[PDB]
């Protein structure tokens, strides 16, 4: 209901090829060209060279299973630095006598 | 390194941008087929052109991998038609004289129209609609020869140049003539024991029909004898019928004829439009139950977007909408149908056939693009057709409340309902197996084209047992004017589609555990037979149709067997029947021959 738009959104990309696969916690903007062969690319498309970005077709009329979904993922690290993050707390009445 | 790290890396990606420009380019052709709009026309050539001119352009790279060193079967098989450069085989003055051709044959056909002799109507509706009604001799005969003088002779000098330039494109892919392009559907390569030959069908179509010969033989003397008595003069008991008379143009489906070829005239008949009326239902309830069926098997419901976007009737003339029902896949999940729904018998079981394909792209939708298809030509059709043969029977139609559960059910009542669905089927194996060898031999270059109508109506009367009134040359074409030769549509289809769909109707009925006659078994509330069907509907043709038939009926081939067992309760009435006349006919009579 709201990233779709009728014609499709292309801003949204994601990298199809990868020369290996990632490490964990890892982000890689690189746009250079993946070589899948031996054929020389040199930034340019052709045999053997293809541009890893791809684009998420978004429509309001694709299928409920395809829809995209918006995902907000929290990482919980513990470290040795002092905590200061808490979940909230309750204040209850107070009583004197 | 390897070619095969080099084909799976171009067919990764190939999924990506085939499936993008597929859905644009299908819809792009629902909003145009929906709506009647100068925008849609348009953007149904540009978006049909870019997935068109795709296929092309990602064809150069496809015939740079070769197969020789690809170990992978299900690789093979998505570059299997990459490989294939289509209508680039061809020069450059022939392929653009080929889209030529094939328009003009399509216009000729859509424009085309018969005048009345005695007062201009075209062909469909209007003469469709005319020659199903009509009784009269002249009537129906008018329409039928007509039609071809300016068609099939019109068409004649088109339908040449569409076999040259349809032959020149099979010697450069390596195949013996364009007949076998159609018989490489079926191919089966690269599994030890499974593999399947193309000139094998050749001969698997005439031994099959060699054991329906006498079930057909019984059914066209019944028809024979009960139109006997209005002329007997040009209806011999030993001839055959003519080919006006069959009920339509071109004598494709008999249930135009069930009118007059009833057995018992005293005896109700089952119908559930008088039912739909008193409980008042309407198009957005109508699919709701048909939904409920795929879920007594196990089969997953509809998605919520599915029935939101169905197109439940015609707007007027406002906003005009093809009829004609058809189940329009596009892409990503996106189902649509467009039909015209009102509240008719046939609507219901339309109902279930058109929701039946949808139901079939759901199970292999997790395939990628070029793994998204069926297995054949014959599966499509065939999978939508087991749902509606189920529906119409009246134990399925006493549950939901359609039929009044005191409804007498016995032999009397079950012999008259089935001899309607043996027009539709009996009568359509002989004709399709007749027009479709027909269409192999003169491919194939061993019927000269002085001889396509000598052999036409020479082979006609040995086949379906029809001879013409009014005897043509070589001039005229009969399948030039028939919908799916002028189109470009397989014709193959519907022959086998009979064999494959009555296979599954009794392996289902097989693992649900039910018993007496296969006509009344019925598939719904049973979930063990829609396990058994949902791995094979899952595979597609990413798999072998010889290996996928083997998991449900446990054949690897056509057999016939199920189509005796389930005409075998007919076939027994109308040999009785036809102990009083002669069963079978003779190729040697004619009606202007005495």
Redesign the interface.
Known sequence: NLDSKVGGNYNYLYRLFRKSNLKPFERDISTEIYQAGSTPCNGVKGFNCYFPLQSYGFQPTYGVGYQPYRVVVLSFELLHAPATVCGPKKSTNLVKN | ?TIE??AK??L??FN??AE?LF?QSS?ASWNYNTNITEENVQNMNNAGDKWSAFLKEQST?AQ?YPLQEIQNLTVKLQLQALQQNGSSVLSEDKSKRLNTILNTMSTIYSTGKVCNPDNCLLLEPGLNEIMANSLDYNERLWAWESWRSEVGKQLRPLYEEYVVLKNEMARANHYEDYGDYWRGDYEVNGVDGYDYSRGQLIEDVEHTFEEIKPLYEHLHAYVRAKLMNAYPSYISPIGCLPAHLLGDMWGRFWTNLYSLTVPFGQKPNIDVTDAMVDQAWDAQRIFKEAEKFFVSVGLPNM???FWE?SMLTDPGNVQKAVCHPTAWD?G????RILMCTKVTMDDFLTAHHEMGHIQYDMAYAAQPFLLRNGANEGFHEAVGEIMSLSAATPKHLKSIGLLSPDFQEDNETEINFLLKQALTIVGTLPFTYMLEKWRWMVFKGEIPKDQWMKKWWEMKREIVGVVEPVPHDETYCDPASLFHVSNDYSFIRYYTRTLYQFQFQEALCQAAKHEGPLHKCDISNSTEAGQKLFNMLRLGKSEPWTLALENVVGAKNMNVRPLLNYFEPLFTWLKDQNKNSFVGWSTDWSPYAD
């Open positions: 390194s790290e080099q890396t171009f990764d990606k990506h941008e993008d859905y819809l790279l740079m998605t919520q977007g976007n596009l990503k999940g996106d189902f």
